[PDB]
């Protein structure tokens, strides 16, 4: 298993990829979570420690490593917010019924007189409340600005309040029609720079408050917000044809709620062990590995990588394999539906070939499997938009296992594939080691097979004729 002959072959690499080594790496990832507040979310020290770990492992194995940074504004709500009247009479208002956060607000604990700003009430109003600087013409600094929705963005309103000396901002719904009087999920924008907290209230509350002389509100907004950057970790073999790159990826960040050991520690740790084993391989085609950042924020890291590649470099990538959640405790054996056989949506030419390879491996291991939707749910998405052939594995998340699936893969019908999905309890004990083992083996077989010959993809591309041959 030391020798390069074993790890270079599609049946040898799975035998050399031990589930127990992946679990050791998973335990390392969970230790990183425990040592940095129980999560590995983007722009947290948990993710910084994950990057350091991935990078030093890849270097120790002999890779030149790129830690690719890209700008990222982190906003994680930490707990429920509070709103209380202190003057004239004490009144505690109900969270998610009277008021909610503006997404991308700053944190704060502010008790101040409330001053309404350019209010235009009534059914059918066309309010310009706080949209202009003159609306704050006599606004006493230190106050909480009571502002009505209308015309302009919430960001513009709150930043005007901040430039006026406001301690905090309460935006209530416009109320120009009957169903515009309640709470909504709204945003001050990723570009908000007001520095002060902003919450959202119902219309009837906003009216009452504007009509209360001497009103003072105590306002507690309990979030993390940080304009910063985060990282992708990219490394490729020094061996291999650089014009025919086989690329694998797994996103390395977690949600803020938990350690994210299955989502997506499983893909990351499996891919890392495979990369260490391939350090000593003899591929025909160059293998590139990426651990993506800020994926739980909307595929930001992988999208950044792909969009910021020179065209000359992007045409060199032949296939992308995505491994996101492959240790689900109530697992099924799901393969991306590259040919559209199940859901009618096809990948770029070559994706059906990749799918057939994954199908072949599960068949060889005496295992059933089936398709899963590929409508841009994970980090292959910008690869899809670029016309690059792709595929990947999935063991299931918040969907419920069917009876047919229960008799195919074991586990419990009627229960989620991963009941700890995006939760605090997504830790080391949430991994099904049979699922992890078999999907790591499948990852290995297909990666290695493509590392020896992309012909099945080349053939599909040639039959498509939509991207002629350049060499
Ligand atoms: Mg105005
Ligand atoms: Zn995921
Ligand atoms: Zn996720
Ligand atoms: Zn299919």
Domains, the chain, ordered by start: 4-76+227-464 (3.40.630.10), 80-221 (3.50.30.30)
Q: How far is the CA of 131 from the centre of ligand 1 (A)?
A: 5
Strand partners, 372: 336
3-class DSSP state for residue 71?
strand
Q: How far is the CA of 369 from the centre of ligand 3 (A)?
A: 21
What whole-number distance in Å separates Cα of residue 199 and Cα of residue 221? 8
Q: How far is the CA of 142 from the centre of ligand 1 (A)?
A: 20
CA angle 442–443–448, rounded 5-degree value: 100
What whole-number distance in Å separates Cα of residue 243 and Cα of residue 438? 30
Q: How far is the CA of 433 from the centre of ligand 4 (A)?
A: 26
Contacts made by residues 163-167, CB under 8 angstroms, sequence distance 24+? 163/133, 164/133, 164/136, 164/139, 165/139, 165/140, 165/141, 166/139, 166/141, 166/142, 166/196, 167/108, 167/110, 167/112, 167/142, 167/143, 167/196
Q: How far is the CA of 148 from the centre of ligand 1 (A)?
A: 10
Q: How far is the CA of 74 from the centre of ligand 2 (A)?
A: 18
Residue 59: count of CB within 10 angstroms of its CB: 12
What whole-number distance in Å separates Cα of residue 358 and Cα of residue 341? 14
Between the alpha carbon of residue 32 and those of residues 38, 265, 459, the distances in Å are 8, 11, 44
Complete DSSP assignment for 143-168? PEEEEE-BSB-HHHHHHHHHHTT-SE
What whole-number distance in Å separates Cα of residue 192 and Cα of residue 168? 14
Residue 419: count of CB within 10 angstroms of its CB: 17
Nearest to 279 by CA among 78, 7, 36, 46: 7
Q: How far is the CA of 139 from the centre of ligand 1 (A)?
A: 13
Distance spanning both ends of the chain, measured CA to CA: 36
What whole-number distance in Å separates Cα of residue 135 and Cα of residue 129? 7
Nearest to 197 by CA among 144, 148, 151: 144
Report whether 144 contacts 217 (CB < 8 A).
yes
Residue 364: its H or E element: helix 351-364
By CB atoms closer than 10 A (0-12, 13-18, 19+), residue 89 is: exposed
Q: How far is the CA of 28 from the centre of ligand 4 (A)?
A: 35
Widest Cα–Cα separation across the chain: 82
Q: How far is the CA of 71 from the centre of ligand 2 (A)?
A: 21
Q: How far is the CA of 344 from the centre of ligand 4 (A)?
A: 9
What whole-number distance in Å separates Cα of residue 409 and Cα of residue 29? 27
Residue 182: count of CB within 10 angstroms of its CB: 14
Residue 78: count of CB within 10 angstroms of its CB: 11
Residue 438, sorted as left (phi over 0), alpha (psi -120 to 50) or beta, turns out to be alpha
Q: How far is the CA of 143 from the centre of ligand 1 (A)?
A: 18
Residues in the chain: 471
What whole-number distance in Å separates Cα of residue 410 and Cα of residue 416? 13
Q: How far is the CA of 448 from the centre of ligand 3 (A)?
A: 26
Q: How far is the CA of 17 from the centre of ligand 1 (A)?
A: 65
The whole-angstrom distance between residue 436's C-alpha and the CA centroid of its chain comes to 21
3-class DSSP state for residue 152?
strand
Strand spans (E) along 314-401: 317-323, 334-336, 370-372, 389-394
Residue 134: count of CB within 10 angstroms of its CB: 10
CA dihedral angle for residue 320, residue 279, residue 296, residue 109, rounded to 10 degrees: -160
Q: How far is the CA of 187 from the centre of ligand 4 (A)?
A: 39
């Amino acid at each position: 298993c030391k020798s390069p002959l074993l790890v270079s072959t599609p049946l040898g690499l799975p035998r050399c990829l031990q589930a127990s080594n992946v679990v050791k790496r998973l335990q390392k990832l969970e230790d990183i979570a425990s040592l940095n507040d129980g999560n590995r979310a983007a722009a947290t020290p948990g993710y910084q420690a994950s990057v350091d770990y991935v990078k030093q492992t890849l270097q120790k194995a002999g890779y030149k490593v790129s830690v690719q940074p890209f700008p990222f504004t982190a906003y994680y709500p930490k707990g429920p917010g509070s709103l209380s009247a202190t003057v004239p009479q004490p009144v505690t208002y109900e969270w998610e019924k009277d008021f909610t956060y503006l997404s991308q607000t700053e944190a704060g604990d502010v008790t101040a007189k409330v001053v309404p700003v350019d209010l235009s009430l009534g059914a059918g109003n066309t309010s310009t409340s706080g949209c202009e600087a003159e609306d704050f013409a006599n606004f006493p600094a230190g106050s909480i600005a009571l502002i009505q929705r209308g015309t302009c963005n919430f960001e513009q309103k709150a930043e005007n309040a901040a430039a006026a000396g406001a301690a905090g901002v309460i935006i209530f719904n416009q109320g120009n029609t009957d169903d515009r009087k309640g709470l909504e999920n709204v945003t001050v924008g990723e570009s908000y720079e007001g520095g002060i907290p902003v919450i959202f209230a119902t219309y009837d509350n906003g009216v009452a408050w504007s009509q209360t002389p001497d009103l003072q509100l105590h306002l507690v907004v309990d979030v993390v917000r940080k304009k910063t950057e985060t990282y992708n970790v990219v490394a490729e073999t020094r061996r291999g044809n650089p014009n025919n790159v086989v690329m694998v990826g797994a996103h390395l960040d977690s949600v803020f709620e938990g350690p994210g050991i299955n989502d997506n520690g499983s893909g990351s740790a499996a891919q890392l062990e495979m990369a260490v084993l391939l350090a000593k391989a003899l591929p025909v085609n160059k293998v590139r590995f990426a651990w993506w950042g800020a994926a739980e924020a909307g595929l930001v890291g992988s999208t950044h990588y792909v969009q910021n590649l020179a065209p000359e470099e992007k045409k060199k990538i032949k296939a992308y394999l995505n491994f996101d959640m492959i240790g689900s405790p109530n697992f099924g054996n799901f393969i991306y539906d590259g040919d559209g056989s199940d859901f009618g949506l096809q990948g770029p030419p070559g994706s059906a070939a990749i799918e057939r390879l994954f199908e072949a491996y599960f068949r060889l291991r005496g295992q059933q499997s089936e398709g899963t939707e590929i409508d841009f749910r994970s980090d292959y998405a910008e690869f899809f938009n670029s016309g690059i052939a792709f595929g990947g594995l999935f063991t299931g998340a918040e969907g419920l296992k069917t009876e047919e699936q229960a008799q195919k893969y074991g586990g419990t019908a009627g229960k989620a594939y991963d009941e700890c999905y995006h939760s605090k309890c997504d830790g080391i004990a949430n991994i099904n080691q049979d699922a992890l083992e078999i999907h790591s083996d499948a990852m290995a077989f297909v990666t290695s097979w493509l590392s020896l010959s992309t012909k099945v993809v080349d053939d599909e591309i040639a039959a498509a004729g939509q991207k002629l041959v350049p060499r």
